[PDB]
Ligand SMILES: O=C1N[C@H]2NC(=O)N[C@H]2N1
Ligand SMILES: O=C1N[C@H]2NC(=O)N[C@H]2N1
């Protein structure tokens with residue numbers, strides 16, 4: 001549902017995710033990370049299932065943040081893949097992949113994987 | 124390098140990725156998978172890091188595809204995270220996460236992980 | 245530390261992990277999963293850093309369970325990679341990969357990824 | 368097929384994996400990586416699923432290597448999860464997780480993920 005996803009969310013590290021879900025399945029917003037070589041806000045773009053199932057299934061969605069803005073350029077990008085589960089305590093549970101740009105030689109260790117849980121605060 | 128991300132790419136499964144990379148870091152285009160609960164094209168959106176480093180590093184990027192279009196709704200979304208490397212033979216090396224929308228009971232097994240390599244051949 | 249890892253542990257799904265850490269960095273035991281095409285106990289084998297660092301760093305370790313025993317054969321195997329963090333509330337935080345045996349054609353979707361947190365109960 | 372997992376395998380990075388597959392599902396041997404904070408051989412232990420299915424499916428298996436030996440202690444461990452496919456050209460296709468022991472502050476970035484393909488060539 002777009003309304004349910006739209007809002008301000010935070011995760012366990014203390015990062016901020018501000019998103020708007022558009023009618024066509026699009027997600028746009030900004031992300032502020034509490035950790036890493038990151039400062040200020042970054043632009044994020046993603047997609048979500050605008051037509052989930054009836055039932056108590058989560059809504060699959062994903063988004064990307066390239067870690068470059070006017071203040072910093074970390075030469076990396078993160079993609080979060082997960083599902084939104086609404087209710088009185090709406091959560092977005094995800095797993096993410098953080099890839100850094102590297103030389104052909106260190107490419108084997110260019111990607112980090114983790115998981116984040118976001119709790120909604122505002123629309 | 125970077126702008127050269129624009130084009131038509133294909134991966135080892137035969138899927139087609141058509142992207143336009145905008146000067147400021149955006150990625151837009153369509154994706155058509157050769158496998159899965161999918162038919163036709165799906166819209167994709169992503170970001171790439173528009174000012175890569177001397178050093179001969181690749182350009183980090185990622186994009187998402189929600190597997191819903193006017194033909195099918197597979198109730199899942201895939202994100203690809205990787206890097207672009209240009210040169211005579213340019214490729215985009217990625218690892219992806221495909222999450223399906225499940226009930227809680229099946230949440231533990233909602234995500235598949237894989238890797239795709241794209242070239243313009 | 246072997247003593248700290250040795251014991252009975254459970255995770256958020258309600259699965260049981262019984263392990264013994266040997267002096268040489270080896271881990272042996274049994275695993276009982278609360279979910280999946282799994283029944284009874286399965287044998288597990290792994291390795292851990294028998295010489296972690298001083299400091300408050302976790303001990304890296306990993307183990308594998310092939311999901312076949314005398315009662316069931318799910319044609320799959322899971323590997324858990326994570327770190328043991330001791331203290332009064334010792335935990336083992338992990339990320340896992342569950343690969344199923346498939347045809348060359350469905351190989352693209354042979355692996356599931358997730359994360360489990362284990363809480364210790366007994367030695 | 369299965370028993371044929373025993374042997375010396377090499378991956379695209381040039382690492383060498385020497386394994387012995389026991390009749391009841393065990394995997395034992397040594398690993399020597401061509402990259403990283405590693406030198407010489409490390410002990411590995413794993414499991415494979417000893418009764419694979421007609422159907423022409425691969426044999427699921429996984430193994431672990433703690434990067435500590437009498438030369439180095441990199442305070443990390445890697446697990447490879449994948450499947451073995453035999454035939455004229457046999458390979459083991461895997462995805463791995465490399466976890467380092469961090470302080471809590473760095474726990475979020477303690478795990479790398481990759482994929483390796485091994486052959487006996
Ligand atoms: O909120 C954050 N989650 C983690 N993933 C990532 O890429 N950077 C970290 N910050
Ligand atoms: O091209 C594809 N890559 C794989 N990942 C995914 O999500 N579907 C498959 N198609």
Ligand SMILES: O=C1N[C@H]2NC(=O)N[C@H]2N1
Nearest residue numbers: 257259277279280322342
């Ligand atoms: O305890 C469990 N964790 C999950 N990972 C896995 O492979 N099966 C599930 N059971």
Ligand SMILES: O=C1N[C@H]2NC(=O)N[C@H]2N1
Nearest residue numbers: 380382400401402445465
């Ligand atoms: O052969 C190797 N594979 C890669 N994964 C890993 O842990 N170290 C590297 N060496």
